[PDB]
Amino acid sequence: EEVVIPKKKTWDKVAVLQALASTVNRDTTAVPYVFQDDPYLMPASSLESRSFLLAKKSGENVAKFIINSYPKYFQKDIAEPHIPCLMPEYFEPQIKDISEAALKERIELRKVKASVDMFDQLLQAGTTVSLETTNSLLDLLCYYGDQEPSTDYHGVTWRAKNNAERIFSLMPEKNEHSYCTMIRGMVKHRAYEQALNLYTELLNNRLHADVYTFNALIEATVCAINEKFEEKWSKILELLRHMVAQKVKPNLQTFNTILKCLRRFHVFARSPALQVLREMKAIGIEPSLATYHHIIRLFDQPGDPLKRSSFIIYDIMNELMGKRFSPKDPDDDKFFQSAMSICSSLRDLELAYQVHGLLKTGDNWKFIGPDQHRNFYYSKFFDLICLMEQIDVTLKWYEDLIPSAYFPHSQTMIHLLQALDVANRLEVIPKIWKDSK
Amino acid sequence: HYVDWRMWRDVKRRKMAYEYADERLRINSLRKNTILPKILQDVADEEIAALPRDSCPVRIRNRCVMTSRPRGVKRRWRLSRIVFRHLADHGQLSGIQRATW
Amino acid sequence: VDVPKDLTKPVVTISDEPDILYKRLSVLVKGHDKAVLDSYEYFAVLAAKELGISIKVHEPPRKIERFTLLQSVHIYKKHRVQYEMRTLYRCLELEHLTGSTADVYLEYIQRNLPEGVAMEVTKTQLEQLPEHIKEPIW
Amino acid sequence: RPPRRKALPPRTEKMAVDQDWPSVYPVAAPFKPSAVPLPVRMGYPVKKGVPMAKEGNLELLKIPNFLHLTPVAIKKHCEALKDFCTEWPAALDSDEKCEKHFPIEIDSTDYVSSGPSVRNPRARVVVLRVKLSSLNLDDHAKKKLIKLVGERYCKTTDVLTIKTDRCPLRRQNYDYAVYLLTVLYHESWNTEEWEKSK
Amino acid sequence: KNRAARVRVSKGDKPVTYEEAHAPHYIAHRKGWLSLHTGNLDGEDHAAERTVEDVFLRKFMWGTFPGCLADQLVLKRRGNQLEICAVVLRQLSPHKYYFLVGYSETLLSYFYKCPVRLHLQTVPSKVVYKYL
Amino acid sequence: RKNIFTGKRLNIFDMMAVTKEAPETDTSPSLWDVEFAKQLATVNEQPLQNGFEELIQWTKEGKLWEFPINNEAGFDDDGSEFHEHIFLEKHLESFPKQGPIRHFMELVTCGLSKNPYLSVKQKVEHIEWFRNYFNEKKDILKESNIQFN
């Protein structure tokens, strides 16, 4: 007779809530949960939905503004355990003396004017500053391009008269990061020529640019001059060979920027984009939703999609089927919009069903994108469903999506009416009118 | 912005008592015993007498937290009898009902 | 037809530490409402039965605290108002369940605890003799 | 004159008799008349009257409804949560075997209350219980331990109960209880010279 | 004559809701409490703090929705949550209602350091239980 | 008629033999990386589909209590141990080994050990204040023929 003690199962603090949430589907009859489940406050249009959400966010912003303006009315902490996210937030530097610590504090606080004044006073007083501190200051200035940050209350955007280049000139010690941050800031603000000049300076200084600098340089090279596709293609390959020589290993952002910039040439870059994708697969840099979205937008052009676009979308869907996505690129959200756009264009309801199933698998739904993108996606999906499906399944989809998924537009309702007329099921026509109301 | 100046005086007394409570406890522990010599206990008596008057906890009065009424205050709710009745008779106090048996 | 094709699930990790054994969990819920306590008892019992946990229920005697206040704002001492705060109880005894199951059930029934109902869960943790006590160090 | 907004018909009309109710109410939420497809009425009726309808019925809004805990919902939740449970040792069929194998019982309490603060001092109390029979002691050690513990030992139940409440945390009180049991056992098995004055 | 929380009949025309109609001796008999929290139970603590919070919440909500409220609030507390259930007239445009909901939720959450939800049920007009 | 993923490549980067097994995570984060992470969070940013998601987000943010309820959650008395709280005799080493002062400080330490409402730092502070007071009063104590250290 022996007794065994089972192993202790452990889980995250939200595991039980997630397990419970797994058992509840979406309420078809209910408007999205962010709204109020009241007939007078349930939004009755897409415009009303957007306006209501914007009004709620405006109320939250006003409350946050008042909290930040009068922190002494909310400092009484009676919560146990302590809740840091409900405490007021301060925006005033503590280190007032001119010092490296004060400069770093202002950089962290993203106070551009305070940071610039701190650097000027530091330079005039001759007090010590490290290469890393000046690098962080350059990061802050170049990323914003000296543009002042925007709060609730208190093209080549790169200014010709800016303090970033002034401080870079005043910088006595410069390294790979110092050049890289300025190059990235120039490219972000579309100062392509200056970024290329500073890259030439870095090459002369025999420094090694980071992968982000390479991506910025690819964008600058593509957008700087108007040339035939082969010129930019050769330039991009030359930059990649430079990266190989520097032994820097590229990332997903590299090929993502390459495709986004090569999107202009369309048919010219179609096959070379396939070569880039094959190179990505061979290296092991798995494409994300943004990569496929960029390839889709590149292959998208008026003409005959059956030539190459159909193959592209079918291969993409075959590759991605049954795979749970993850946040890899900032442009991963627009994949489903373009995918459904081509699904509607090709009139392939089976392809659209596959795309929707891919969206529903796992947490892929979170990648549906902002409200406008979600509305466009569902509008195209429902239009295709009405066009190319039996009226019974069409009505089932209409019940499932509207109004839980989105609010239809008059054109979608007209398409549904046309489908009903084709099915000769006019008995639903009155109900639809009520739905329109 | 307290209800009356008496409530303000009570708040000041409570704050000062909270500030000086540790020292008062230490000195009283030095006093309220027979182990230590009498001279030290007399010195402790003088020292605790030298403390500010408002630091003494006995001067704290349990006034109502909404009308400053110094009597009829239910300690569990810190409200005067009139305010407590006004809230309870409107159903705004959980679980409190008229007692009939 | 808009059912999700795949379901995502939370991560349950089987650690190597042996689980804690509980002889008895005495979940004593206090409330001001007998019907609310009855509904909560039904919910908890159904959850325990569907989770394979032995459970017994009993109702400790209620406590009716009473107190008296003067009625009129001024004088009239002979006239009073008497208030009371009934506290109804329900004790659920769960026997012979491990630490993981106890934690899951407690979280489930606590997140769903109705407003106005307090809970006092008493856990009997079975333990083994420490090494210093199994044999005398002397 | 600006147009006046017209309230929509409640979505209970669009509901289906054989729908999935837990979808409508996944979590605890106040009673919404536009979301509950039941003609429930609450309120003491006036003379020759009917109880007030649910629309605007504050009495129903007061009730902590269990509409999010229907039996179907409870069954689905338990099915989901079964993955988190660990089977109790089938060998320990009765409390007799539990005492045979686990002779120390630790009692602790967790208090759940409504409020922003979760702290509660009464949660720091730990109660250790052990049967002296389940310990390994002789006659003299048992007799000395009984006198040492005093009232903590009930001869009727043969159970020693050590209650620790002097430390701020429950874990500290549990450690103190274990330490107290250890030192009591060791002193019980230790014999002093002055013990001869018994 | 008892005067607490009673609406004395004047002409037979003044409308009163269900709560206003019932006298204090009907609490827990024909009308429930307007605030539910574990403070007043046996052995529980912090009753005074919860009472002060409830009074301030009622005053703040009455002054934040001027004339919108059609009845008293219901303040439910579950753990550290705080649900304010209100019945509001359909006077304002829903934009203002949503703005006020977001505002009040955020401000009360930051002021009481607890997640405050605000659930509004709209009625066309003040519900009349009887006339006095 | 040919798979897009299979075909002639750029052939610039060979298949890396081993990926980066020596990461540079020790480097300080940059504003650019912070904004990249913000955009990675934004691409998942969606309105809450149901109340369960709201509860999950609140629990993640810390606004909502974890369950099952632990009354001591988010509170440790500086990681103290029972022996630090109770056995405070080690803090009396700056006091006479025997004498009335030792008896009084024994009473004080017993009271402090019985106290569950004070952290170890405050209990030590009380004893330190007593030591300082007795040191300042060593004249009177030595007049009473009671030596203090």
Swiss-Prot record, chain A:
It is found in: Mitochondrion. Abundant in testes, skeletal muscle and heart tissue. GO terms for cellular component: cytosol; mitochondrial inner membrane; mitochondrial matrix; mitochondrial small ribosomal subunit; mitochondrion; nucleoplasm; plasma membrane. GO terms for molecular function: ribosomal small subunit binding; RNA binding; rRNA binding. The modification N6-acetyllysine is found at K72. Signal peptide: none annotated. Its main location: mitochondrion. It comes from the Eukaryota. GO terms for biological process: mitochondrial translation; regulation of translation. The keyword Secreted does not apply. Keywords: Acetylation, Mitochondrion, Primary mitochondrial disease, Repeat, Ribonucleoprotein, Ribosomal protein, RNA-binding, rRNA-binding, Transit peptide, Translation regulation. PPR repeats lie at residues 95-129, 130-154, 175-209, 210-250, 251-287, 288-329, 332-366, 374-408, 409-437. It is linked to Combined oxidative phosphorylation deficiency 51: An autosomal recessive, mitochondrial disorder characterized by intrauterine growth retardation, low birth weight, poor overall growth, progressive limb rigidity, delayed psychomotor development, hearing loss, and optic atrophy. Brain imaging shows abnormal bilateral signs at the basal ganglia and brainstem. Patient cells show decreased mitochondrial complex I and IV levels and activities, and generalized mitochondrial translation defects. Mitochondrial RNA-binding protein that has a role in mitochondrial translation. Belongs to the mitochondrion-specific ribosomal protein mS39 family. The gene is PTCD3.
UniProtKB/Swiss-Prot annotation, chain B:
GO terms for biological process: mitochondrial translation; translation. GO terms for molecular function: RNA binding; structural constituent of ribosome. Signal peptide: none annotated. The keyword Lipid biosynthesis does not apply. Transmembrane segments: none annotated. It is found in: Mitochondrion. Belongs to the universal ribosomal protein uS14 family. It is linked to Combined oxidative phosphorylation deficiency 38: An autosomal recessive disorder due to mitochondrial dysfunction and characterized by perinatal hypertrophic cardiomyopathy, growth retardation, muscle hypotonia, elevated lactate, dysmorphy and intellectual disability. This is Small ribosomal subunit protein uS14m. The chain holds residues 28 to 128 of 128 of the full protein.
Curated annotation (Swiss-Prot), chain E:
One of its GO terms (cellular component) is mitochondrial inner membrane. It is found in: Mitochondrion. This is Small ribosomal subunit protein uS3m. Keywords: Mitochondrion, Ribonucleoprotein, Ribosomal protein, Transit peptide. Belongs to the universal ribosomal protein uS3 family. It comes from Homo sapiens. One of its GO terms (biological process) is mitochondrial translation. GO terms for molecular function: RNA binding; structural constituent of ribosome. Component of the mitochondrial small ribosomal subunit (mt-SSU). Mature mammalian 55S mitochondrial ribosomes consist of a small (28S) and a large (39S) subunit. The 28S small subunit contains a 12S ribosomal RNA (12S mt-rRNA) and 30 different proteins. The 39S large subunit contains a 16S rRNA (16S mt-rRNA), a copy of mitochondrial valine transfer RNA (mt-tRNA(Val)), which plays an integral structural role, and 52 different proteins. The gene is MRPS24.
Swiss-Prot record, chain F:
It is found in: Mitochondrion. It comes from the Eukaryota. Transmembrane segments: none annotated. Component of the mitochondrial small ribosomal subunit (mt-SSU). Mature mammalian 55S mitochondrial ribosomes consist of a small (28S) and a large (39S) subunit. The 28S small subunit contains a 12S ribosomal RNA (12S mt-rRNA) and 30 different proteins. The 39S large subunit contains a 16S rRNA (16S mt-rRNA), a copy of mitochondrial valine transfer RNA (mt-tRNA(Val)), which plays an integral structural role, and 52 different proteins. Belongs to the mitochondrion-specific ribosomal protein mS31 family. This is Small ribosomal subunit protein mS31. It comes from Homo sapiens (Human). The lineage of its organism: Eukaryota, Metazoa, Chordata, Craniata, Vertebrata. The gene is MRPS31. The chain holds residues 247 to 395 of 395 of the full protein.
